[PDB]
Amino acid sequence: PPDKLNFIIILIDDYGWTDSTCYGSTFYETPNIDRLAREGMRFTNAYAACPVCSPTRASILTGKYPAHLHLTDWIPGRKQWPTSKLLGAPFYQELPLWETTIAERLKPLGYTTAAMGKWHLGHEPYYPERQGFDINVAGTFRGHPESYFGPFDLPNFRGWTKNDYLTDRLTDKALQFLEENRQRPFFLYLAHFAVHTPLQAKAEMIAKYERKARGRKLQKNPTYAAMIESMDQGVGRVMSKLEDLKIADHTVIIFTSDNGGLMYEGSRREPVTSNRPLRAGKGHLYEGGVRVPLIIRWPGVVKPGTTCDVPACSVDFFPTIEEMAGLRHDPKLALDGVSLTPLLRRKGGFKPRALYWHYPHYSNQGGVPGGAIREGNLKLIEFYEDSHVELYDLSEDIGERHNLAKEMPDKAAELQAKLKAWRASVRATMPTVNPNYDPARADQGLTGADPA
Ligand SMILES: [Ca+2]
Ligand SMILES: [Ca+2]
């Protein structure tokens, strides 16, 4: 007969567009992720459907936009500033069980399914076992690890010692799943806790990067760089286990991020990484917070070493996988993604389209309520506090410094209206004018509030 495809999604947490060597970094050292890029297709215009953790994770699994899911902030969300211009919108504190995940869709084709690492889509019963997965390892309502060192006390991930590194032990448990299901068709959602705060790593590895951090100016944080090395080791271990088991040939790998790099977590004087050239990072609707790494190895279909400039989003993985597994798109599902198989096959037929964002919240990283649309090369951001819009040309201004909104006031009007129409198509919940808005004491004093 043929060879049913396996699927691994490797999802690094808060991993920036430029936090890998094959994406421009000179600090961070990511040799395995590089080998994956050389073995596959690297996407220059890949996006996360939301600039914070929970909703992007909900996007990936459902093929639906966060605004459409009504899960639009990280759970449970920034505390309300008592005096801001806006009251945050309410949202589901869980990925609802009535949403279909890619795991549920594969199950009936004989797939074994596991979610391992960061869940952050609600308390149990909204955990993975009740959402298409056979195995949960380390998933909870939590959006971060208490520590990167043992002992541990998480679901099916219980106990090591103060000398055991999380990223290392999580990887062993994922290898365990590969070893167990070596002969079966499987889907693995591998969501590292890396590289979310708190910054902790092996001392010897930190030392390496302090020696390199001298007069670096930009990407400067040794602990973080070490987190990335320990993460990159975990990725090689997966890649090379697939070799030892003689199934790399028919296993699809998708390597990406749930949002852009952290840089100025709420009133902290130091940034964690930098996304230059891109403006800002995690918690913002600027490209820093939404443009992410995306590498796809599909041995024998994706010509290795290729790249793709076409904009892709978290919503596209559901239908991509569905089609990779020989499934008819269910017309009752009403997803927001399209399949990337035409791009991966370097064939044509990939219809040109718009991407949408909707973040009716204040973020912990300086972000403010807004939405955005990207059509071809132009990108409009709408700021919900005062309805003002910014428009950038990302072919000429990837760093979003020159605002064209005054210069091209009709493309601005066109895109704002296209975005408003989408907001309606999905009944995006909007924020509200705060009755206790007091401009005097409305500054929340988060160091991320752009200037760039
Ligand atoms: Ca995240
Ligand atoms: Ca379900």
| Domain ranges, ordered by start, for the chain | 6-353
Q: Are 119 and 192 in contact (CB under 8 A)?
A: no
* Residue with token string 């902790």: 200
- CATH number at 6-353: 3.40.720.10
107 CA → ligand 2 middle, Å: 12
Ligand number with the minimum distance to the CA of 282: 1
What is the number of residues in the chain?
A: 452
Q: CA 86 to CA 42: how far, in whole Å?
A: 39
Q: Which letter does DSSP use for residue 125 in this model?
A: T
Ligand number with the minimum distance to the CA of 95: 2
Q: CA 206 to CA 227: how far, in whole Å?
A: 9
194 CA → ligand 1 middle, Å: 9
Beta carbons within 10 angstroms of residue 108's beta carbon: 8
**Strands of the 135-137 sheet, one edge to the other:** 135-137, 112-117, 186-191, 6-12, 251-257, 294-297, 41-43, 306-308
Tell me the two tokens of residue 131: 């959402």
Q: CA 320 to CA 222: how far, in whole Å?
A: 37
CA distances 136 to 128, 380, 447, Å, are 6, 39, 37
Q: CA 31 to CA 329: how far, in whole Å?
A: 37
58 CA → ligand 2 middle, Å: 12
108 CA → ligand 2 middle, Å: 14
Q: CA Rg, the chain, in Å?
A: 21
Beta strands in 89-225 (DSSP E): 112-117, 135-137, 153-154, 157-158, 186-191
In this structure, what are the phi and psi dihedrals at residue 234, rounded to the nearest 5 degrees? -50, -35
52 CA → ligand 2 middle, Å: 23
Q: What b/e readout covers 134-162, taking b as 16+ CB neighbours within 10 angstroms?
A: bbbbbbbbbbebeebbbebebbebeebee
Beta carbons within 10 angstroms of residue 348's beta carbon: 7
363 CA → ligand 2 middle, Å: 28
* Residue with token string 């000429």: 396
238 CA → ligand 1 middle, Å: 22
Resolution reached, in Å?
3.1
Q: CA 357 to CA 56: how far, in whole Å?
A: 11
Q: Are 307 and 42 in contact (CB under 8 A)?
A: yes
For residue 317, which amino acid is it?
A: F
| Distant-in-sequence contacts of 204-213, Cβ < 8 A, 24+ apart | 205/229, 205/230, 209/27, 212/27, 213/27
52 CA → ligand 1 middle, Å: 5
β partners of residue 379 = 374, 392
Instruction: Find out whether the peptide bond into 185 is cis, omega within 30 degrees of 0.
Output: no
Q: Cβ contacts of residue 317 below 8 Å, gap of 6+?
A: 9, 60, 63, 102, 254, 256, 337
Q: CA 106 to CA 68: how far, in whole Å?
A: 22
80 CA → ligand 2 middle, Å: 31
76 CA → ligand 2 middle, Å: 21
405 CA → ligand 2 middle, Å: 42
Residue 236, class by beta-carbon neighbours within 10 Å (0-12 exposed, 13-18 middle, 19+ buried)?
A: middle
Q: CA 115 to CA 105: how far, in whole Å?
A: 15
124 CA → ligand 1 middle, Å: 20
75 CA → ligand 1 middle, Å: 11
Q: Are 297 and 35 in contact (CB under 8 A)?
A: no
Phi-psi bin for 275: left (phi > 0), alpha (psi -120 to 50), beta? alpha
Question: Which method was used?
Answer: X-ray
104 CA → ligand 2 middle, Å: 7
Angle at 208 between CA 26 and CA 274, to 5 degrees: 35
Q: CA 238 to CA 296: how far, in whole Å?
A: 14
Q: CA 41 to CA 343: how far, in whole Å?
A: 9
Tell me the two tokens of residue 356: 């949408």
13 CA → ligand 1 middle, Å: 5
Name the residues around ion ligand 1, CB cutoff 5 A. Answer: 13-14, 53, 258-259
Angle at 222 between CA 219 and CA 226, to 5 degrees: 110
Q: Cβ contacts of residue 356 below 8 Å, gap of 6+?
A: 65, 67, 336, 371, 372, 373, 419, 422
Q: Are 415 and 373 in contact (CB under 8 A)?
A: yes
95 CA → ligand 2 middle, Å: 9
103 CA → ligand 2 middle, Å: 9
- Name the CA dihedral angle for 129, 135, 141, 142, rounded to a multiple of 10 degrees: 180
- Picking from 132, 339, 167, 166, the residue whose alpha carbon sits closest to that of residue 252 is 339
